[PDB]
């Protein structure tokens, strides 16, 4: 393998990856669109900006790789390869990643004027993707337009697992990672999180696909809330009673908000021409949204219920919706952790195996 200069950190990729150029920044790493001559297909390469020079960011990647190995689905990115630019367990300090380069990220169609069927289908797919991880007890907690790529033929795939995992009893105290414009309430407020929080995102997404503007403009996590409750009425006392002790007071002390009717949040026009070809009509996407775009964490729809719902229903091909959920060994627990050194090794336990 060789190297090529980029931004600041230079690369150390294998020869089978020519004409190497950058494509996207990265909160956790970097990524180029080099051509895998040895396989024929320009591939996406990312090496991770934060290997394991800490404690809180190695655990993330480690969990991402393993999830990567045990994943597989037409709507979920698939690992093409993993290599290390080092020789012995000593010099180890960089793990690169290969993967099929798509045609662009949703953050592209976000700026396009879909027309149902298409959207109708992507949602379905996106929906399908999530569904996978869920059906095996897994949360993406980062579904956002940025991490959603297409392929010139309404084909879609979710990407990045750098932080995904499963839980039930956990906070965050570091939401300074899960991009807030699409951060869910159970997230924001240090509330517990089942595993549907993913859908929330998915909503803010649809919102982003029909309004063209983000949905809940954040100026600091603290103002996030303010901009959402401002658009969804102040949550019910049933919800309130749910929050931790402290967050409560603040949360109650808020300025009681009207909330809006989705007939008003998303008026007809914002929805693709009603070229009806079935159960596909304006009032449908909206109807769906109002089942997603919801604060209480328990009264918000779900994947299972999602797919099996009118604006999705149609192309519900079990061949890819009732997908055999992926499994894992027993190295995953999530709320636990190991040394800030052997973490490195368990990582090496990968790059070597996968080659």
């Amino acid at each position: 393998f060789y190297s090529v200069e980029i931004g600041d950190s230079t690369f150390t990729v294998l020869k089978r990856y020519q004409n190497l150029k950058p494509i996207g920044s990265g909160a956790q790493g970097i990524v180029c669109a080099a051509y895998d001559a040895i396989l024929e297909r320009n591939v996406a390469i990312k090496k991770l900006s934060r290997p394991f020079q800490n404690q809180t960011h190695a655990k993330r990647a480690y969990r991402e790789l393993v999830l990567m190995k045990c994943v597989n689905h037409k709507n979920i990115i698939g690992l093409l390869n993993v290599f290390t630019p080092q020789k012995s367990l000593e010099e180890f300090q960089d793990v690169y990643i290969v993967m099929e380069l798509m045609d662009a990220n949703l953050c592209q169609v976000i700026q396009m004027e879909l027309d149902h069927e298409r959207m109708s289908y992507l949602l379905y797919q996106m929906l399908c993707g999530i569904k996978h991880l869920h059906s095996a007890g897994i949360i993406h907690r980062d579904l956002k337009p940025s991490n959603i790529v297409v392929k010139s033929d309404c084909t879609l795939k979710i990407l990045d697992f750098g932080l995904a995992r499963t839980a039930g009893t956990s906070f965050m105290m570091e939401p300074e990672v899960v991009t807030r414009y699409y951060r869910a309430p159970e997230v924001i407020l240090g509330m517990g999180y089942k595993e549907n929080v993913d859908l929330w995102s998915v909503g803010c997404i649809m919102g982003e696909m029909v309004c063209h503007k983000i949905l809940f403009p954040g100026r600091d996590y603290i103002d996030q809330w303010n901009k959402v409750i401002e658009q969804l009425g102040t949550p019910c006392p049933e919800f309130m009673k749910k929050l931790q002790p402290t967050v409560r007071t603040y949360v109650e002390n808020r300025p009681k908000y009207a909330g809006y009717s989705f007939e008003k949040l998303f008026p007809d026009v914002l929805f693709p021409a009603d070229s009806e070809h079935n159960k596909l009509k304006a009032s449908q996407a909206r109807d769906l949204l109002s089942k997603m775009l919801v604060i209480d964490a328990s009264k918000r729809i779900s994947v299972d219920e999602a797919l099996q719902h009118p604006y999705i229903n149609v192309w519900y091909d079990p061949s890819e919706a009732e997908a055999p959920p992926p499994k894992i060994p027993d190295k995953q627990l999530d709320e636990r952790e190991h040394t800030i050194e052997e973490w490195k090794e368990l990582i090496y336990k990968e790059v070597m195996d996968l080659e």
Partner: peptide
Amino acid sequence: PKRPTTLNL
């Protein structure tokens, strides 16, 4: 029905 096949990016 059908399924879309193209997506003009």
